[PDB]
Write a protein that binds this ligand. Structure first.
Ligand SMILES: CCCCCCCCCCCCCCCCCC(=O)OC[C@H](COP(=O)([O-])OCC(O)COP(=O)([O-])OC[C@@H](COC(=O)CCCCCCCCCCCCCCCCC)OC(=O)CCCCCCCCCCCCCCCCC)OC(=O)CCCCCCCCCCCCCCCCC
Ligand SMILES: CCCCCCCCCCCCCCCCCC(=O)OC[C@H](COP(=O)([O-])OCC[N+](C)(C)C)OC(=O)CCCCCCCCCCCCCCCCC
Ligand SMILES: CCCCCCCCCCCCCCCCCC(=O)OC[C@H](COP(=O)(O)OCCN)OC(=O)CCCCCCCCCCCCCCCCC
Ligand SMILES: CCCCCCCCCCCCCCCCCC(=O)OC[C@H](COP(=O)(O)OCCN)OC(=O)CCCCCCCCCCCCCCCCC
Ligand code: SF4
Ligand code: SF4
Ligand code: SF4
Ligand code: SF4
Ligand code: SF4
Ligand code: FES
Ligand SMILES: [K+]
Ligand SMILES: [Zn+2]
Lengths: 360, 263, 48, 176, 129, 96, 108, 114, 95, 207, 116
């Protein structure tokens, strides 16, 4: 019954994204980030946008930043529903998947109403967001958020105290704090083992230092504590979304610098300067001053970062993507030691692995 | 020992007498923006895009025409220089037409590119624009004179390089127009070169019209065989087809010109 | 339409039994909805 | 600020120990899970009756491409190639020349719909609202070749869907 | 200096066998090392600063279905950038590519005089401004 | 408009048509050649010339921001109309 | 519709290719196809499977799964909406409805 | 000064005698640092911080107040860091990083953009 | 919403909650699919004076890295001050 | 401050500069250059012999404590004699700070594996070997991780073509997937996008 | 000097050659298992001749570091085969069975296209 060695063979979804990005302008490369961790689309966009904005030495306007936090946390709910329910579905508990994917279906509507796409929105961009929220959207997000914690409670009623669920998760895949750090874990893989770390708290970006939330911390570093952390993080996202809805400011939604963000279509059709800048931004693109940055965010699956190198032109020179699931899967052999074959399925689930980001 | 010492943003450069401020900046690798100036044409000094601040001088000078003086410190990036460029670019674009999508120069336009690098990002011009009649000067050079920025490069080329005095300016002020006054074809064996020197889409290749955008072409540096001069050329191709022929600078052969047959 | 139904079931179409010479009694297809009604049926607008 | 998700020490008195023994032996927490699935059995399902009912969309929805006209019937596309330059997938191929009347118009406008990522960048870049992504999403085919759209196909899509496309543009152009 | 014990290797650096390139695209290719000519349509000189390496153009043909430009040349788009001509040559040699070098063409300094436009007795007098 | 070649194949508004010996027309056997029958060149020609009372007129294609970039058209020549480079509408100065 | 969610490849009648097919993965996809009992159908879902999509020009990507297996329905989109995929499945149903296996057998 | 039940970090056991453990480790570190040349910056800096940490240990008997002074997290985390520093110092003696730069890089090695 | 009171009672009792107050299906509380047109505000750079681009050009204020040391007594320092210890949540310290 | 301009943080800039000097004073044997970017990121450029000593000091030293290896990657710069730049991005939870350590190598010079210092480095170094062809000495299990088995070349090198050299299809005659030289129905279209006018004077290089 | 470099495994060609012969022996003995295990339709003779052909094409190397990398790569290739990480398609890719023979003489290339 016992697993002695676990050798993951990946690359089955390696699509040479990093080499493709070197042939795209910075705007053209943005949609590649939707297709990495393709469960956390807008969080991937935010990371890339922050990195480019840093090299550009510009900052997006306040309303865009609140929109980016609002949809970042909606995206965390999207990811955690997937993480928890597919974790449950793969060990036989199929029903929560169906209940919660109806909730995912309604958050896909928020994606589609702001961007016109259900998943690969391409909505968060360097300089802000592509378009402002349509009238009536915040009311619908409020109505969704009002009932969501009940949906979480129903999920917990199925799993949290279930002895079968606890038997499958408790003391499975224990990770010590010191090992979690040296193996390069992040996100819940760290907090499950008691490490008090969360980039939104410690290295905040956008307006995360203006919202109140608590970081759930585990005590045993096993699959069950990581499951509890993810479920509790969903509650905190609802708590954050509640503040974003109330504190959403007025104003423009992309930086008012037409050498980076395209002008409004009405301006493009009346002003000579606007038309030139529209023409150049959609052909050459904006040039980015030479330099290199490592920019990271607390993505739903852990620390997601890009090492972005600019040579001074309108196309990136190098873009290395740091996917949290890459280091996590690299630790599968370590975590599966002394466990049974059925436990490897539970351990892969608790790592929350999407091969889009692992293989790029 | 005739060289004098001048400074470009504080860096010393030794230049021979008669060197202009613009040429002094070239020596340290700084390219002053320009429209009217062309190094193979007579100095004109009319576009004012090359205006630059001299340290301690209250007035900006036209870098393309001003001889540099011993001890001058040329500030190519001071707020005074940058505000002069923004002001001039604003005047150039006030009456310019919103033609970039339909204009062949788009993508390789010095007005577009210098507007991006040295101009403002928005307009505060709230009036109607000038519109100009088009002039027919033959089957090689199309004219869209509403795009003309009155840099007079074509006039100086036709007079000095081609030895033809058919191009001039008529009228005065904002209605000043480049053209031939009468209905006349600028048929010279070097006529096609006024397409290259014209910084905007006012003069464009009629055979080339609408067929390609500059970014999508591949450049093959080659040689002309239409005569025995051996003019250096760039052959523009796209998706396996020849699109146009352009000059390639060779100081000892064709400089930066080609004949109309070559072109 | 039936506004008492929950969002998504409050509007529906019963397809014609014959369209462009094709017998569609059993063989129906979402592509049969013309563009003017397509906007209403997909709730891109409120008014038919 | 942080909270502990699992750091409660169970009480060890009779009342509590016997409550946990009852749960172990009488399966009470398992019965509770049965109650939740039974409650769902008596809820109305969320299933819509496709294709008679359709999932809701918005005017911004990015679907099948189409080339548009002016009210006079003249094509909007003036072959600027901004769409082809911006296309992240290089899905657009354009050729152009002067038309018989001298107008600047395309002679080729192809979209490989199997390269396209349906990002909508082309319709953002277009200076004259010529290329758009319409609302149609029901255009799957039986062959690969049918998804390689040439200009005729795209103009036909514009004429086919313009009634809906124009209304959707009218509803969202003030956000653009 | 170092605690790492070095070895002496007098061989010319050649990495053809360990690059994975097919034999066809090492020996039959000709690399061109040049500084790009200024695009004559513009006065900006910023694209004439670096050295480039490109490869000989090969056949492109029309796709029977769509008329697209097809190619069988894997190196048709490869363009490398170099700081100096010597760096470009070094890269080409160790990769086993035959090459040609074209010397950089700097514009020669010109004598510009606005006053010459108004000469009393020379042909440089302009007839118009 | 849509004319036909001697082989019977329709000619597109771009002038395309496979000639007699081109095998590639086999792709249309048992299927059809998609052709758009609203030739924009004919449609724009049906539009009447606008008579205006000024030397310069502007066109944005109609519908404001839903049209094209606003351009100004000179009407000094009396031997031709002024045509909009974007939408092809024609203007003519009345009297002068 | 009678379309069971999770069915083993041994009892499956249709393979849906939902995502990018890389070179490293192509042999395993062909193996599953070869092991499907007949009648078997392939639905190609999304731009990547249809023709390479965003990654068409990659060194590691198969430019359309129809280089590996014969495809019956192509569903466009990146991704196709859930409803678009359902439309495609219903299209396959009508394609099966049009089959004439026994009529052709009778006229052999 | 009660004995906390857990450190909260999985795999990090509670220490019964933190003050005595810290004194032994810091004293060992200073002993190891005596084998490094007096002008090596690693010795100067490491002795500075170790003596400051050691002085706090000798002056603060309450564990809870000691942790606040050290600012290194749990006392078991501080102990773990002392062990890491002791391990580092022994390796430093073999590496001798205080010696001059082994080799200068090529002329334009760190030039960006190229 | 259309369930009889008996079925409402049955599923509320089985789930142990008042499900009717938070139905997971949407009815008339959702916003209209037709909305009045917006009028979006303009940013701070929409001004007719005192608006020179050189006073607000973020990209041109970027500078190359400061070289603090190049190959071609003092108090020890850390890259930054040690992180302050987190406080327990007062909203709900223990789950 | 200017609404569209990113604000500078001068305190962090000074702190990172002082710590950069601190590192350079302690490991003069290896540190070649220390710089801090205008957006406050510290880079330590070292001789490749210093990988293990420098990384070990940064992980274990009391005033550093960079316990987490955030990322390890390479950059290919063909114009350099040592074309490959190896970049280590480290994180310190104790001091809530990041640091970047960079070194270099050519196609034939091994780099020492950092797996002894960070077990996270195991797969990162396999990826660098796979994508760039940089060999890591004493790596426990160095082999390809992302490319197909038997794949030839290192595709993240700047001179490896975007579409590669070979492509796959199923061949019915041999009843298997086969590899053949790449032909494209539509060639990838190279665009020349760079403006011929300088964008950033602050980065101008001597003639 | 610039010729004083860091070795990979071998300090000179004679040390490098030993590793080459050890790799060749390992491949030589693996072929019979590979033909059986992957159920190939080639003979053991064909497999071993293919191994010899692969070693010969690199016979002209005189740089020990280059030879080291060739052996390192050759051993990775062997491990993929022995562990059955490769599938039969990967093993048969050395034989180019579906590629038609491209012409090699001047005239034959002249008739078909433009390439040298
Ligand atoms: C187990 C046996 C249970 C027997 C009760 C079945 C029943 O009629 O429940 C429906 C009825 C509706 O409950 P509901 O969940 O609130 O329905 C939602 C709407 O209110 C419902 O409102 P509505 O507007 O949707 O009503 C329209 C609907 C209303 O149609 C009905 O009246 C229900 C049809 C079920 C017939 C039984 O019309 C239909 O669609 C019926 C078409 C026929 C469907 C096929 C049913 C045949 C089942 C018998 C097969 C035998 C052959 O149930 C009740 O009202 C609770 C009373 C249960 C009585 C139990 C008596 C037996 C003791 C156990
Ligand atoms: C006890 C409970 C059992 C559960 C129910 C079992 C199912 C019962 C209901 C279905 C029965 C259908 C039997 C046919 C099976 C399907 C056959 C098929 O799909 O066709 C493929 C094949 C097609 O043959 P083919 O040769 O033309 O095509 C094959 C082509 N290759 C070889 C390339 C693959 O059909 C047949 O072979 C003929 C089968 C005979 C069916 C009986 C026909 C009788 C009428 C003809 C005589 C006319 C006078 C009367
Ligand atoms: C007067 C004195 C007379 C003398 C007689 C007195 C006897 C009365 C007192 C004894 C009571 C006996 C109760 C009988 C049930 C058996 C109890 C049992 O074994 O359950 C415990 C078992 C293990 O529980 P666990 O927590 O995982 O681990 C404990 C061991 N370390 O865990 C389980 O078994 C849980 C069940 C596992 C299967 C879960 C899936 C099914 C759950 C739904 C079932 C619904 C109820 C079914 C009823 C059907 C009736 C027809
Ligand atoms: C297909 C569906 C068919 C159904 C059609 C509709 C009719 C529905 C009838 C089904 C009735 C069951 C459904 C309701 C169950 C949910 C109720 C519930 O949740 O109770 C939970 C309760 C509290 O549990 P807990 O929170 O853990 O508290 C522990 C300490 N107090 O936990 C408890 O108190 C549990 C108490 C009961 C424990 C009994 C242990 C099992 C004994 C087996 C006897 C079986 C006898 C019945 C068999 C059928 C014969 C009639
Ligand atoms: S000349 Fe330049 S700025 Fe003027 S319309 Fe043409 S491309 Fe645009
Ligand atoms: S036509 Fe061109 S070259 Fe002549 S004056 Fe006008 S802008 Fe200058
Ligand atoms: S939607 Fe995106 S990928 Fe598709 S054609 Fe338009 S720009 Fe290209
Ligand atoms: S569709 Fe629009 S962007 Fe594309 S070429 Fe035509 S006018 Fe230009
Ligand atoms: S969503 Fe788009 S990128 Fe992702 S697998 Fe589908 S077609 Fe490919
Ligand atoms: S370039 Fe000097 S005034 Fe025109
Ligand atoms: K011109
Ligand atoms: Zn018009």
């Amino acid at each position: 019954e016992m697993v002695r060695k676990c050798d993951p063979h990946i690359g089955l979804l390696h699509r040479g994204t990093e080499k493709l990005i070197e042939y795209k302008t910075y705007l053209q490369a943005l949609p590649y980030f939707d297709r990495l961790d393709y469960v956390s689309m807008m969080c991937n966009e935010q990371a890339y946008s922050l990195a480019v904005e840093k090299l550009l030495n510009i900052r997006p306007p306040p309303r865009a930043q609140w929109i980016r936090v609002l949809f970042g946390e909606i995206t965390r709910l999207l990811n955690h529903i997937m993480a928890v329910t597919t974790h449950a579905l793969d060990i036989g508990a199929m029903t929560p998947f169906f209940w919660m994917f109806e909730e995912r279906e309604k958050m896909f509507e928020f994606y589609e109403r702001v961007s016109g796409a259900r998943m690969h929105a391409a909505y968060v961009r360097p300089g802000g967001v592509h378009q402002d929220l349509p009238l009536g959207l915040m009311d619908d997000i409020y109505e969704f958020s009002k009932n969501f914690s009940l949906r979480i409670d129903e999920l917990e009623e199925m799993l949290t105290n279930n002895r079968i669920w606890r038997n499958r998760t408790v003391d499975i895949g224990i990770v010590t704090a010191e090992d979690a750090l040296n193996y390069g874990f992040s996100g819940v893989m760290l907090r499950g083992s008691g490490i008090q770390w969360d980039l939104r708290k410690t290295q905040p970006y956008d307006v995360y230092d203006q919202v109140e939330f608590d970081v759930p911390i585990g005590s045993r570093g096993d699959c069950y504590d990581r499951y509890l952390c993810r479920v509790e993080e969903m509650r905190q996202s609802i708590r954050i979304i509640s503040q974003c809805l109330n504190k959403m400011p007025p104003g423009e939604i992309k930086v008012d610098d037409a050498k980076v963000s395209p002008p409004k279509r009405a301006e493009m059709k009346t002003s000579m300067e606007s038309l030139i800048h529209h023409f150049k931004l959609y052909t050459e693109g904006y040039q980015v001053p030479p330099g290199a940055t490592y920019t990271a965010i607390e993505a739903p699956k852990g620390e997601f970062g890009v090492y972005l190198v600019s040579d001074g032109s309108s196309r990136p020179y190098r873009c290395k993507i740091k996917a949290p699931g890459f280091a996590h899967l690299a630790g599968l052999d370590k975590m599966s030691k002394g466990h049974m074959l059925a436990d490897v399925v539970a351990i892969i689930g608790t790592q929350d692995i999407v091969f889009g980001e692992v293989d790029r | 020992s005739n060289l004098i010492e001048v400074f470009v943003d504080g860096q010393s450069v030794m230049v021979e007498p008669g060197t202009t401020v613009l040429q002094a900046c070239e020596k340290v690798g700084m390219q002053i923006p320009r429209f009217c100036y062309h190094e193979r044409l007579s100095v004109a000094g009319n576009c004012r895009m090359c205006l630059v601040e001299i340290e301690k001088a209250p007035k900006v000078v036209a870098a393309c025409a001003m001889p540099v003086m011993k001890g001058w410190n040329i500030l190519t990036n001071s707020e005074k220089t940058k505000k002069a460029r923004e002001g001039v670019m604003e005047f150039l674009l006030a009456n310019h037409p919103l033609d970039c999508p339909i204009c062949d120069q788009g993508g390789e336009c010095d007005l577009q590119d210098q507007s991006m690098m040295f101009g403002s990002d928005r307009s505060r011009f709230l009036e109607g624009k000038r519109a100009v009649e088009d002039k027919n000067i033959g089957p090689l050079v199309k004219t869209i004179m509403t795009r003309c920025i009155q840099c007079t490069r074509c006039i100086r080329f036709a007079s000095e390089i081609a030895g033809v005095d058919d191009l001039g300016t008529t009228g005065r002020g904002n209605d000043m127009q480049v053209g031939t006054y009468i209905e006349k074809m600028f048929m010279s064996e070097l006529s096609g070169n006024i397409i290259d020197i014209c910084p905007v889409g006012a003069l464009t290749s009629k055979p080339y019209a609408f067929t390609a955008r500059p970014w999508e072409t591949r450049k093959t540096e080659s040689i002309d065989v239409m005569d025995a001069v051996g003019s250096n050329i760039v052959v523009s191709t796209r998706t396996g087809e020849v699109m146009r022929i352009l000059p390639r600078m060779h100081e000892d052969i064709n400089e930066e010109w080609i004949s109309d047959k070559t072109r | 339409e039936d506004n008492k139904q929950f969002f998504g079931r409050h509007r529906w179409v019963i397809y014609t039994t014959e369209m462009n010479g094709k017998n569609t009694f059993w063989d129906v297809d979402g592509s049969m909805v013309p563009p003017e009604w397509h906007r209403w049926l997909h709730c891109m607008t409120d008014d038919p | 600020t942080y909270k502990y998700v699992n750091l409660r020490e169970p009480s060890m008195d009779m009342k509590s120990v016997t409550d946990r023994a009852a749960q172990t032996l009488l399966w009470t927490e398992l019965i509770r899970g049965l109650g939740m699935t039974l409650s769902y059995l008596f809820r109305e399902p969320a299933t819509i009756n496709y294709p008679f009912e359709k999932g809701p969309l918005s005017p911004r929805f990015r679907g099948e491409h189409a080339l548009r006209r002016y009210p006079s019937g003249e094509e909007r596309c003036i072959a600027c190639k901004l769409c082809e330059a911006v296309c992240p997938a290089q899905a657009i191929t354009i050729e152009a020349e002067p038309r018989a009347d001298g107008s600047r118009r395309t002679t080729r406008y192809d979209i490989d719909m199997t390269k396209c990522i349906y990002c909508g960048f082309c319709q953002e870049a277009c200076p004259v609202d010529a290329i758009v992504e319409g609302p149609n999403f029901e255009f799957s085919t039986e062959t690969h070749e049918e998804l390689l759209y040439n200009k005729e196909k795209l103009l036909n899509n514009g004429d086919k869907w313009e009634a809906e496309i124009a209304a959707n543009i009218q509803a969202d152009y003030l956000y653009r | 200096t170092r605690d790492t014990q070095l070895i002496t290797v007098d061989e010319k650096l050649d990495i053809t066998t360990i690059t994975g390139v097919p034999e066809e695209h090492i020996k039959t290719r000709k690399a061109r090392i040049f500084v790009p000519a200024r695009n004559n349509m513009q006065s900006g000189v910023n694209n004439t600063k670096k050295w480039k390496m490109e490869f000989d153009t090969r056949e492109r043909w029309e796709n029977p279905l769509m008329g697209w430009a097809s190619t069988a040349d894997p190196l048709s788009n490869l363009v490398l950038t170099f700081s100096t001509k010597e760096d470009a040559v070094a890269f080409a040699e160790k990769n086993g590519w035959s090459y040609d070098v074209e010397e950089r063409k700097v514009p020669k300094p010109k004598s510009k005089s606005y006053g010459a436009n108004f000469s009393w007795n020379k042909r440089t007098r302009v007839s118009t401004k | 408009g849509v004319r036909t070649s001697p082989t019977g194949e329709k000619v597109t508004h771009t002038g395309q048509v496979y000639d007699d010996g081109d095998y590639r027309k086999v792709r249309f056997v048992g299927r059809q050649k998609e052709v758009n029958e609203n030739f924009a060149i004919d449609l724009i020609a049906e539009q009447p010339v606008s008579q205006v009372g000024s030397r310069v007129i502007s066109c944005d294609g109609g519908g404001g921001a839903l049209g094209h970039p606003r351009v100004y058209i000179n009407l000094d020549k009396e031997t031709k109309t002024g045509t909009c480079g974007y939408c092809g509408l024609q203007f003519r100065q009345q009297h002068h | 519709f009678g379309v069971v969610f999770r069915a083993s490849p041994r009892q499956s009648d249709v393979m849906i290719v939902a995502g990018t097919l890389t070179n490293k993965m192509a042999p395993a996809l062909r193996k599953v196809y070869d092991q499907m009992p007949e009648p078997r159908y392939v639905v190609s879902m999304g731009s990547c499977a249809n023709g390479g999509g965003y990654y068409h020009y990659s060194y590691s990507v198969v430019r359309g799964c129809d280089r590996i297996v014969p495809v019956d329905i192509y569903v466009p989109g990146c991704p196709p909406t859930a409803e678009a995929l359902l439309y495609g499945i219903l299209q396959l149903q009508k394609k099966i409805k049009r089959e004439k296996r026994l009529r052709i057998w009778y006229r052999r | 000064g009660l004995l906390k039940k857990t450190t909260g970090l999985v795999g990090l056991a509670v220490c019964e005698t933190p003050h005595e453990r810290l004194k032994i480790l810091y004293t060992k570190i200073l002993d190891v640092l005596g084998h490094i040349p007096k002008n090596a910056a690693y010795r100067k800096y490491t002795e500075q911080i170790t003596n400051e940490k050691l002085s706090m240990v000798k002056a603060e008997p309450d564990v809870k107040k000691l942790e606040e002074r050290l600012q290194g997290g749990q006392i078991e985390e501080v102990i773990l860091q002392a062990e890491n520093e002791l391990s580092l110092a022994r390796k430093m003696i073999q590496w001798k990083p205080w010696e001059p730069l082994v080799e200068e890089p090529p002329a334009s090695q760190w030039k960006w953009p190229i | 919403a259309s369930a009889t009171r008996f079925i409402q009672w049955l599923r509320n009792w089985a789930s142990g909650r008042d499900l009717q107050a938070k139905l997971q299906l949407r009815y008339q509380e959702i916003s209209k699919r037709t909305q009045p047109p917006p009028k979006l505000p303009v940013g701070p750079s929409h001004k007719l004076s005192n608006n020179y681009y050189c006073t607000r050009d973020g990209r041109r204020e970027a500078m190359p890295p400061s070289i603090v040391m190049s190959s071609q007594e003092k108090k020890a320092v850390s890259p930054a001050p040690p992180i302050k210890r987190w406080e327990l949540s007062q909203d709900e310290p223990y789950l | 401050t200017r609404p569209t301009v990113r604000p500078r943080n001068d305190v962090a800039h000074k702190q990172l500069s002082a710590f950069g000097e601190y590192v350079a004073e302690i490991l003069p044997k290896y540190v070649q250059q220390v710089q801090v970017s205008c957006f406050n990121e510290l880079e330590i450029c070292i001789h490749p012999d210093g990988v293990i000593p420098v990384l070990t000091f940064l992980r274990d030293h009391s005033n550093a404590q960079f316990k987490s290896l955030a990322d390890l990657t390479a950059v290919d710069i063909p114009t350099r004699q040592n074309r490959f730049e190896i970049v280590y991005n480290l994180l310190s939870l104790r001091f809530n700070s990041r640091i970047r350590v960079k070194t270099y190598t050519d196609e034939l010079t091994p780099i020492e594996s950092s797996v002894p210092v960070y077990k996270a480095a195991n797969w990162y170094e396999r990826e660098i070997w796979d994508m760039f062809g940089v060999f890591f000495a004493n790596h426990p299990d160095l082999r390809r991780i992302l490319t197909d088995y038997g794949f030839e070349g290192h595709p993240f090198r700047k001179d490896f073509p975007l579409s590669g050299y070979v492509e796959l299809r199923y061949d019915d005659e041999v009843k298997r997937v086969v590899a053949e030289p790449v032909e494209l129905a539509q060639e990838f279209r190279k665009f020349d996008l760079n403006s011929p006018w300088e964008a950033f004077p602050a980065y101008r290089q001597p003639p | 000097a610039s010729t004083s470099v860091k070795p990979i495994f071998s300090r000179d060609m004679n040390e490098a050659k030993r590793r080459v012969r050890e790799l060749y022996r390992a491949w030589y003995r693996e072929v019979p298992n590979t033909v059986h295990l992957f159920q190939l339709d080639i003979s053991v003779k064909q497999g071993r001749d293919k191994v010899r052909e692969m070693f010969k094409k690199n016979a002209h190397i005189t740089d020990p570091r280059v030879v080291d990398l060739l052996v390192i790569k050759g051993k990775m290739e062997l491990e993929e085969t022995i562990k059955v990480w490769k599938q039969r398609t990967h093993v048969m890719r050395f034989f180019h069975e579906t590629e038609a023979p491209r012409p090699k003489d001047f005239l034959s290339k002249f008739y078909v296209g433009h390439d040298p």
